[PDB]
Structure formats: structure tokens, C-alpha cells
Write a protein that binds this DNA or RNA. Structure first.
Lengths: 50, 124, 51, 50
RNA sequence: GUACGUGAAAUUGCUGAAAGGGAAGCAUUGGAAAUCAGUCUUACCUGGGUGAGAUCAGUAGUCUCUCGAGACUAUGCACUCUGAACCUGUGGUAGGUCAGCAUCAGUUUUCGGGGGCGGAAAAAGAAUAAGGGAAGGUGGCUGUUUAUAGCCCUUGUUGUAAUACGUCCACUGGGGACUGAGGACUGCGGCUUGCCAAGGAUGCUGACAUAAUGGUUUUCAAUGGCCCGUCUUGAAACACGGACCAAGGAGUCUAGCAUCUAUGCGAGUGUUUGGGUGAUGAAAACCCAUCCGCGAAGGUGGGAACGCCCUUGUGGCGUGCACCAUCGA
RNA sequence: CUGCCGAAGUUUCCGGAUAGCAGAAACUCAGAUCAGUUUUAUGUGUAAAAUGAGAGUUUCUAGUGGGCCAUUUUUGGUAAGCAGAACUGGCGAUGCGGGAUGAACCGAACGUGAGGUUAAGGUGCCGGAAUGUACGCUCAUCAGAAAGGUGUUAGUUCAUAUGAACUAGCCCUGGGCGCUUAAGCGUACUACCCAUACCUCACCGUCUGGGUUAGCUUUGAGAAGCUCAGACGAGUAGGCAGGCGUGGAGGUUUGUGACGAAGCCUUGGGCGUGAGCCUGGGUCGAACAGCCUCUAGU
């Protein structure tokens, strides 16, 4: 479990670094980069049962 | 586990104060348009199972003992092994003669008597 | 079992029960002060500072 | 994603709202899917795994 | 005390109490006055002495049971025991209520500090070598171009400036409130067998108790709340019924039918028309003769349960209830 | 007296039989089907992916078998309104916060409590909460919460600094006290107030899912017991369940009672969610009760 936590944190930090580096390059050479569409959202109910 | 009650005041019947033919014993108001039955503000409460007390504290006097009604001196003997949780209530019609026999026996047994000073009188 | 609910964030001992990684994190990392390569396209700046 | 599962993440074990305060609960229900601890549960949610 | 058992409520008179600007009324929260709840260090343990007793005698008898288990009667008080009674302790620990702080735990609300990554790698700005420009023009003279103020723009400009914003910290330091449910032991973790903030509160103290904490009554203070039942009407509006109190007062008893459940028996079933009988209520109970009533007039697959296994588990091979499909009769 | 479930409020044929809703039982399956669901795609329907939930039968039996309001949809209207059908929800069986108050509006749907935070609405006072910050607009001599104006405010456009024509806002003319660069309006951003709502915990009950015997010195076998976990809690008609109480009856407590039964009153003390119960004091003077069943002029 501890090692699987190492891989997950490494995967998360690499993903954030890749996305930041992806946008820096596009801004550097002028092309426009669209980030990948997210697959996960968190819904919160706001209206009651009436 | 201390003796804590969800409510002190009794449940009186609705409109039982106005009338005298109406008894204070709680009666469920079945009136079709009864707003007091309808739980409006400024009205009275109503018995619910939500008002029950702790099941490890139900029937417990404020000092933690549960009242136990002893008719004669035989009954006060069986509280030998529950003296820490039960208190020997003396029945109301037990004469002053057997009333002393019950209190003197219960004093040595170690149990607590709730009405040990009724109809009797000490002498030094 | 589980008489009470203890917050993994608030309680550090429950965190060790759930996170056998929290012992070694070192969350803060120096990823700067290494001749930062200022990245900005010149034409990107031109279209930024227009109208 | 991490904070909700830690502070407010309750399993569904035998149709009961069982809090996830120990890693044995997740693996007893999600052992067949190689989910064995809370970190894996976060990774199965955040990365949207199979 | 013959207006005579108990003497309730309505209702009325006297007294005491508080309250009393067109109601009252009740509910919450208290306060006040008035009044009750309940109080208890006391016992335990240990030490010795003194006299004891007995369930104890390197002891003697009877009784009832089943050798020894009781109840006793002598006899001695050791050997133990009786925390046995007293002196001896002035030895040691001290039962409820209420406040105080502390270390913790859960739920929180509120101030902080320190940092990571990201954004025009903030933008700026200062710093910073210039150029150009015009101004609301300094100097020169409204006009003018850095002067005897300079500014702005453009580069240049240190740099990886810093701040801010956004976000993260399994970074950290304080303040305050409300909770203690559970009751040996487990479990899961960390520190290193032990210990711990890890499967729910424990310590240090005090005061009160020999009143505090409490409860009840009247009243007041703040917040509130349109008369109840019926009927009407979505709803009300309503229209009714209600001067007050006590007592009386309305799905009951029975034959028939069907259903569900319980019991006895089960291809049976049911004594009580009647007879036998019943000495202690004998209208009960108990027993059975002849009728009579009501009943009575095969293959295929899916399947409950079980066995054999056997790569086990998975499944297969089967045997197949109730029943359902099917072919059937 | 308490606890659980709880409609329908009406189709459809035709006073009814149906149905439907709710139950109650019996079945078969979760490796099976579903959904006031959403997609995909084939031609709005149909068919085949996600999101969830176990889903489907048979039997028999209570109640309903109205409406009102609102939304919408239309048709006509008809002075004008409106009317007429529908359409779909809400109330009706439902309390609470707000709207001055007020059944239809805005919130939110209910066990008893402690803390926390909110929704709608609010923070001048009554009134819990900033006489908050920034920016404007409003002058009413009826504010405020069709038009005209020697009415302003900002102005725009066009003419040659001035006018004309205009643009728009607002005023004038046609809940209380008070408020006036607001305590009015309009926008924005902070902070705060509080509901039967949301969170965390306690407790009562309900349902559901467990655990428990060669009854192991944890002793917790009234197995009808003890124990563990989670969610839940409006309610009429109606369905189901457990209890409290009265008179008398067989059993029982080797029950109570002239040292005071039953009864009665009383701001005595307790117990139970409650029906009810136990007890102290005062009167009182001859009977009475707890428990298991039987029973009814309860």
C-alpha cells in the first residue's frame, strides 16, 4: 500500500508538471493548447424536496 | 449512566384547565379541525415515543435506585443482592407494626428504604 | 468496532492508520532558483497587448 | 477528492453506511478490483479507473 | 347530635396572601416569595494486648440422614479461626452535590506564523544606460522641448526583484464554546518487551454539605397562542350544540355463512337427543349403545432438498418434493 | 394510551362491476429484470450504452370512486374584461422560517435534546443582525421604499461657445415611528442575523442485516434472553400491533388490614412518552389487593 501511494503521488505530480509544461511550450511558440476534458465532476444538491 | 430525564413537566390534556368536567389525564385530541392537534405555535406538546428516557435509566429514582414495592418482611429479604440498584418501597397499607419489622430488617440487610419514617416515631 | 469517528486529517494517529505514506512525504520541494527560463511567445505578447 | 473521502467517506457494506476509518473495509468490498486502501480509492476516483 | 356512615365536585360566606389602564386564559425561560425533596467518615485494612467461643481439640457422647453431612450435649481454649468484644493506634484509605484548573478525545468557530507550485514565470515599481516625443511648459519665452522642473513613451534595465492574486502543505503556533455515548482483554497503528493522543474521559483539587444543588405553588418579566365538538366548506366563512358540577349513558346478545389462525383426531370425524353414572352441589365431572350429519366416489423440462464427486471452487453427474410448464390422460 | 404502515380523492366501461392506489399472503428469482431516467443510433417513435435500484408474478380486501388553487395550452372571445375546454403540478392527509398581519407567494417538508452552519428574507428604531464599504441616481410643495412640465438630472445628435431638435432616468401635475448626498432606488463586494432545514453527537422507537450453547469463571440461557450495526420518524379515511384501566370468576401471593381496609381531599415525594402507578400527610372506619388465566351491563 505504501509503494502504491508512491506511484500515485508520482503519477499525480507528473501529470500536473506535464500539463504546466504543455501550456508553457504553447505560450512560448505561440500555438494554443486546449487542456484535456475532465472526466470527473462533483455534484452538490442545493434544492430541497418541496 | 446518570439519571437524566428528557422532560420534567407532565402532559396535561388540552383545555383541561378551562373546564372541570374535563380531566387532566392526557387524552389524544381527535378533533378534525383541531389546530392544537395540528402542532401550531403557542400550543401544548403531545406524547411521542421520542420522549422516552434512557433504557438503562427508565424507572430510576433521581438518586439512581429503582423503587421496589415490598408488602411484607418476606419481600424485603429478596432485595439482598440488588441493594445497590433497588429501594424497598413500603406499601401504603402495611401497618405500623410490620412497618418497623420491615425497616429494621432492611437496615441490617443493607438495602435502602424509601418511606422508612411513615406512621412511626423514634424514641431515645 | 469503530465506536467513534476520528478525522484522519485532524488526528495524526488515525492518519498513520489509513496513510502508511504520511510518515515520508516532504510535500514542499524546491523546483526553482535554477535559472528560470522565462517562457512567453513574442507574438503571443503582441496579441495580448492589442486593442 | 482526498478530503471528502477521509472526513466524510462512508462505505456501503451490506447496505449500511459504514465509515471508512480502516483500510480493511475497502479491501473486503473492493478486493476483487485491486482496491485495497484509501489511497487506491482516491486513485480509482480521481483518475477514473476501470 | 336524630338536617345523624364516608361527605367528593359545582356553588356560597369569612379570613390570610399576592395581584388587579377595556378581559381573563395557557405555553416556554427564568427571578422572587412561600415550601418540600436528602443529606453524611465509616467503614475497610493492618498491628498488638486482654478475656473469650468452635464450624477448632495429637479430644469424648447422643439424634436424623448417607463412612461423613447436619443439629446438639459434655470438656479444654492450644493449633487454627471468629478483621469476633474491649483496650490498644491519634496507623493507613475516606460518600453525595456543586464549582476550579489540567492533560486528552469527538464536533466545531476564530486569530496567526512559515512555506511549495502557478500565473505577461504577475503586472507594476524602484533600480536602471539612453533615445525620442509631446505636454497641462520647467528653464528660456501664449508659443516653447530640458535647461536654471522634468515628465511620458520606446527600448535598454537588475532578475530568477519583490509584492499581489490564485492554489497546496500527511507545515506549525495560540484563543473559545458544546459534548464523555461505551465499560476487563482483544482490533488497527506509532514509539521502541514496555509505552502512546491508536476500537468514546481521565487526573489534580476544593467548597458545600451539619446548604448547595434542586423540585413544586402563587405571581411577575420578555416571547408568543383567534372557542371547543359537530356539520359545512378545498379551506374557512359558517350555521349549529355548550350556564356549571356529579352520576347514568350508546357495535351488544344470538342463529346462519365464508375466511384466517390455534388445538384434537385424521379416511375419517363429531360424548352432552338419550342412557349409564356421579355419597365430599349431584344442574359439574366421568363413561358409550343405536342411529345420524359432514367427508370419502403416464413421459419431457424447470424446479425444493440431498448424495456422488472433482479443477476441488467452478460446475458436472445424478435422485427430483410443492408446483409450473409441457406432451397428457 | 402509545407504535407502524397510510391512500384514494377517478381513469375506464357503466346505480354498479372494473381498474388504480394502499396493504395481507403465497410463490422465483439478483447469473433477473427493471426505471413519470438519460444517452447511442436506426427510421418524434423504435431499437440497442450510462446512471441507479433486486426485480417480477398469483391470490383476497379495506378506504376512495370530490374539488379548490396555480402553471400552461389553446378557441373564441367580449364593450371590455372574460368565457370555454384542456395541460400539469401544489394544497387537499402538512407543521415550521419568511412575506407588517393574510390558505395558497418565497424557502423548507416534523421523534426528544446539545452545539455548529445556513435557505427565503433581513441588519435606523420597534427587531435578532454594519447608522457597512465603493459608486452613482432621487428632491417629492402627495415622493420613494397616455402624456405635459420657465421640472430637473445626466446627456446624445444636429446647427452655427450658444441654442434648437432629441436620448433616457426620476419627480411634479395629470406595518408604525421616522428616513432624504437615506434608514429611497440601482449595481458590486465584504461582514453579520436564523427554521421543526443541513452537519456532528446523545436518547426513544421502528424496520432491516447480523452474532450467541458439549451454555468455557466475563459470568450477558426470562434463546420470549443478551448483544451488535445502519438508515429512518408529517398524517385524514383506513389497515396492523403492544399496552393501561373498571366490575366479577377459578388459581396464587403460607398477601395487606382496628398498631387502621376501601374511599376522600392535599402547592408532600416519586414512576411511566402516555393511558396510568407507587408513596407521605389529613380525614376516615371494615374491608382490600399484586400476579397468571376466565369473563362482561367495562
Amino acid at each position: 500500500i505504501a509503494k502504491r501511494a508512491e506511484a500515485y503521488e508520482a503519477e499525480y505530480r507528473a501529470a500536473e508538471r506535464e500539463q504546466i509544461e504543455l501550456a508553457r511550450k504553447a505560450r512560448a511558440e505561440g500555438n494554443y493548447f486546449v487542456p484535456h476534458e475532465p472526466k470527473l465532476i462533483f455534484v452538490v444538491r442545493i434544492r430541497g424536496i418541496n | 449512566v446518570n439519571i437524566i430525564k428528557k422532560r420534567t413537566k407532565p402532559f396535561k390534556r388540552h383545555q383541561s384547565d378551562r373546564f372541570k368536567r374535563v380531566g387532566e389525564s392526557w387524552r389524544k385530541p381527535r378533533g378534525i379541525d383541531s389546530c392544537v392537534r395540528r402542532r401550531f405555535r403557542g400550543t401544548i406538546s403531545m406524547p411521542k415515543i421520542g420522549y422516552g428516557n434512557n433504557k438503562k435509566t427508565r424507572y430510576c429514582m433521581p438518586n439512581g435506585l429503582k423503587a421496589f414495592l415490598v408488602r411484607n418482611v418476606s419481600d424485603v429479604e429478596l432485595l439482598l443482592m440488588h441493594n445497590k440498584t433497588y429501594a424497598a418501597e413500603i406499601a401504603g397499607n402495611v401497618s405500623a407494626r410490620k412497618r418497623v419489622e420491615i425497616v429494621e430488617k432492611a437496615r441490617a440487610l443493607g438495602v435502602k428504604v424509601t418511606n422508612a419514617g411513615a406512621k412511626v416515631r423514634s424514641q431515645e | 468496532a469503530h465506536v467513534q469517528k476520528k478525522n484522519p486529517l485532524k488526528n495524526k494517529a488515525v492518519l498513520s492508520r489509513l496513510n502508511p505514506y504520511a510518515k515520508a512525504y516532504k510535500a514542499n520541494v524546491k523546483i526553482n532558483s535554477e535559472k528560470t527560463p522565462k517562457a512567453a511567445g513574442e507574438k503571443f505578447l503582441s496579441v495580448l497587448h492589442e486593442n | 477528492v482526498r478530503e471528502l473521502i477521509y472526513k466524510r467517506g462512508f462505505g456501503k457494506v451490506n447496505k449500511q453506511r459504514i465509515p471508512l476509518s480502516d483500510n480493511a473495509i475497502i479491501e473486503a468490498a473492493l478486493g476483487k478490483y485491486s482496491i485495497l486502501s484509501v489511497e487506491d480509492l482516491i486513485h480509482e476516483i480521481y483518475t477514473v479507473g476501470p
